[PDB]
Amino acid sequence: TEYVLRSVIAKEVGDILRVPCMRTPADDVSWRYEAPSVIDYARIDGIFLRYHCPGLDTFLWDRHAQRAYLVNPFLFAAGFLEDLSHSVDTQETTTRRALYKEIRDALGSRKQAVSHAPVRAGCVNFDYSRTRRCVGRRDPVLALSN
């Protein structure tokens, strides 16, 4: 039975900065970030890369929604960099390479935090990060499996 790091109510920028550094749950636990159904940049107002936190807490702020989604530091970094590396001009792109080099610099600031833990035992369906109960024929916030 499995868990989520729910979104945070965030009407103002301080509603986010207030939030303390996420502690990492036990190896016991099967948790997952609650991220947006889809990543739309015309719908993201601020990106909080708080790499001073032991867990690289990154927050995605959607102001209209008044939610801040805490997401996978590393895959967000990787993905967002990629999206910036796309050619899609010269000002447009020079700005982009700028923001790129500055993100990449801070990420490498923390490249020693990436896990070395080998992926653990048990059945998978359909994600290592989902639950690992074996289902057969005779068949920090909760989301009991179906």
Binding site: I44, H52, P73, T95, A98, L99, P118, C123, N125
Partner: protein, 719 residues
């Protein structure tokens, strides 16, 4: 607290284009206070390890600056998989694509080469011959079914029609791959789950086990390249996933390589997809690898084996759905065999290699269009009906069993269950008659027919009629599995494997079935039986000590195969209340369900309950006990009294047991009909080789349905 990040200045030669919009009045005096939101803009507040001494920077970018066959979907938008990566724990709690230290995946023989793009030892699935029709799965007659090895169905409209699909690796450590899926194959039990996803030009395969880390293989067109995504240490260029070098049509990638053999198996697995295009060549090697399993792990999981087995089956489904599209047709005999052997292998893999119990095995094949499948299954149901009425052939009734097996439905198993029981009965009469049940056509029939009489136990909760029918089939197959048949079945299998090259000459387990694998005999791997199997063996070039070890391993395969929890559970009478004392639970060596109410059990130790007999004249080191179990906590020791015979003596229903001083049980024959009762009342006529006489010094017992066991003096054979 006080936040005062270093916004840049339009002048900055570097981060200058990232200065905040004039609108904001972001002066050094204002930047606390927050109030960083600007509609047309997205800001990024970066902070590093040295916070607060380094207050981190606040960057500004206008939102607008952010806005054929097998393709990687890269980035966060508009990648459908993005969300699933962002939710993952990848690199937070696991490393699903660890640093490879010279980890190497050598090219392999049989591995597709520029010369043979299908495989060196490939034997391609042939095309429907010139000007052969391709019927729909609706006008399917019993005549079609008989000439089925030469009846072609057109794949278009039967096969799942390809449609776009995004594959997310479970590792969340690779970019989502966009494909045209051709369906998939998935199977597992209460202790393992394997899931293959097929796409044109691609396969996605996850093997998982309860007590072992997973394995992942991703097969793609040879010119594609999959990076490991999200590891910050690959900032310059992303770290391409480990894997074998690229073949002629496919390049294979792997996640979660390591522990010696785990790596080995995984090399074999990454090798499988490029080796053949014939779903059969995989099946064959699967059934062969299953007979080679080491006896040592017992009923525990064997991760090495299971990976190899699961990869073979997933790979065969890949060759099958591929071959189909290829010449746009499926031979009806191949459809049926693929569905049958899929079902058969998935069970042998889960039971023998994943450590599971048959009552939990499942298998969802979905290469077919769903609507066409329902139609096919409905028609097949009807032909199962027809066959049992119209046709008389043994070939036909065995096709009817195998069809029920593929349907795996109660209705199906219903029509054919009486037929199967009646056949089993007929073979016992052939064997009591003196004949051997060795013709491949016969074994294949015996295979599915026992499968059929067993099916209700695996689905849970059988009827009184269903239990009775299977109990008799078990008394029979146990009788069919004498010591002699056992030794023989070792010689036949050894000879069968010898003949196979896994291409021109395949190895289908069902065609080499023996009663032994569907008996209630679990003593087949004991000392006395290995000797039998060896003295009736053909000399080879293997050291004596090894051929003996190879034998014990196959002995063990057949006993493990035959051992179904659900049946033992059902034919060993337990009491209605708890029995005082520590249960001395001895696992039955032989189980004889002699009446619906009661059973005899053969063990190496007295049980604490039941009428218990201790066989006499048997080597003290390897003793034999026969216990009569009923729903009761009571036990009595009893001596085995001697008796002679001599029109109805009341022998019918009783069971004839021959055993040696060596402590070996030679035959557990069911006294079936009256003819068999008279064949017994005469004695052992000299020069009349019944199944009731042996040339081996041994003692003869008769076990009555009512709990009494006697000593048939006349059938003893002294030295």
């Amino acid at each position: 607290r006080l936040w005062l990040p270093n916004t840049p200045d339009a002048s900055d030669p570097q981060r200058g284009r990232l200065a905040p919009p004039g609108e904001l009045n972001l002066t050094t005096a204002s930047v606390p206070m927050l109030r960083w939101y600007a509609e047309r803009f997205c800001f990024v507040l970066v902070t590093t390890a040295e916070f607060p001494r380094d207050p981190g920077q606040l960057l500004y970018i206008p939102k607008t600056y952010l806005l054929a066959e097998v393709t990687q979907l890269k980035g966060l938008s508009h990648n459908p998989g993005a969300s699933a990566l962002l939710r993952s724990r990848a690199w937070v709690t696991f490393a699903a694509a660890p640093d490879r230290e010279g980890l190497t995946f050598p090219r392999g023989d049989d591995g597709a080469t520029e010369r043979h793009p299908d495989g060196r030892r490939n034997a391609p699935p042939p095309g429907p011959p010139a000007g052969t029709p391709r019927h729909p799965t609706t006008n399917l007659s019993i005549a079609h079914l008989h000439n089925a090895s030469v009846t072609w169905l057109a794949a278009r409209g039967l096969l799942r029609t390809p449609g776009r699909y995004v594959y997310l690796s479970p590792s969340a450590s690779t970019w989502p791959v966009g494909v045209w899926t051709t369906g998939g194959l998935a199977f597992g039990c209460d202790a393992a789950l394997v899931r293959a996803r097929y796409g044109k030009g691609f396969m996605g395969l996850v093997i998982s086990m309860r007590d072992s880390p997973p394995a992942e293989i991703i097969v793609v067109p040879a010119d594609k390249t999959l990076a490991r995504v999200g590891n910050p240490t690959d900032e310059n260029a992303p770290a391409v996933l480990p894997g074998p070098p690229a073949g002629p049509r496919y390049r294979v990638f792997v996640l979660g390589a390591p522990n010696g053999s785990a790596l080995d198996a995984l090399r074999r697995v990454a090798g499988y997809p490029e080796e053949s295009t014939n779903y059969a060549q995989y099946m064959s090697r699967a059934y062969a690898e299953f007979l080679g399993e080491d006896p040592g792990s017992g009923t525990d999981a064997r991760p090495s084996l299971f990976w190899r087995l699961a990869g073979l089956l997933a790979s065969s489904g890949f060759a099958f759905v591929n071959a189909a599209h290829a010449h746009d047709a499926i031979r009806l005999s191949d459809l049926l065999g693929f569905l049958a052997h899929s079902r058969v292998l998935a069970g042998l893999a889960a039971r023998g290699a994943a450590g599971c119990a048959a009552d939990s095995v499942f298998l969802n094949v979905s290469v077919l269009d769903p609507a066409a499948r329902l139609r096919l299954e409905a028609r097949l149901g009807h032909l199962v009906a027809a066959i049992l009425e119209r046709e008389q052939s043994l070939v036909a009734h065995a096709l009817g069993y195998q069809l029920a097996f593929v349907l795996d439905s109660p209705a199906a198993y219903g029509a054919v269950a009486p037929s199967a029981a009646r056949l089993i009965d007929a073979l016992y009469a052939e064997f009591l008659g003196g004949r051997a049940l060795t013709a491949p056509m016969v074994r294949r029939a015996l295979f599915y027919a026992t499968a059929v009489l067993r099916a209700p136990f695996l689905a849970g909760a059988p009827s009184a009629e269903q239990r009775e029918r299977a109990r008799r089939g078990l008394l029979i197959t146990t009788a069919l599995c004498t010591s002699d048949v056992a030794a023989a079945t070792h010689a036949d299998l050894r000879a069968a494997l010898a003949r196979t090259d896994h291409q021109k000459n395949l190895f289908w387990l069902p065609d080499h079935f023996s009663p032994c694998a569907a008996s209630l005999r679990f003593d087949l791997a004991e000392g006395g039986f290995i000797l039998d199997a060896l003295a009736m063996a053909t000399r080879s070039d293997i050291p004596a000590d090894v051929m003996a070890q190879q034998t014990r391993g196959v002995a063990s395969v057949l006993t493990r195969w035959a051992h179904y929890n659900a049946l033992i559970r059902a034919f060993v009478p337990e009491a209605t209340h708890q029995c005082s004392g520590p249960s001395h639970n001895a696992e039955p060596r032989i189980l004889v369900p002699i009446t619906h109410n009661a059973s005899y059990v053969v063990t190496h130790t007295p049980l604490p309950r039941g009428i218990g007999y201790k066989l006499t004249g048997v080597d003290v080191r390897r003793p034999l006990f026969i216990t009569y179990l009923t729903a009761t906590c009571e036990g009595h020791a009893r001596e085995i009294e001697p008796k002679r015979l001599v029109r109805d003596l009341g022998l019918v229903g009783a069971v004839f047991l021959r055993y040696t001083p060596a402590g070996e049980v030679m035959s557990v024959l069911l006294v079936d009909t009256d003819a068999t009762q008279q064949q017994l009342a005469q004695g052992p006529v000299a020069g009349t080789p019944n199944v009731f006489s042996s040339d081996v010094p041994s003692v003869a017992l008769l076990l009555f349905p009512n709990g009494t066991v006697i000593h048939l003096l006349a059938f003893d054979t002294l030295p």
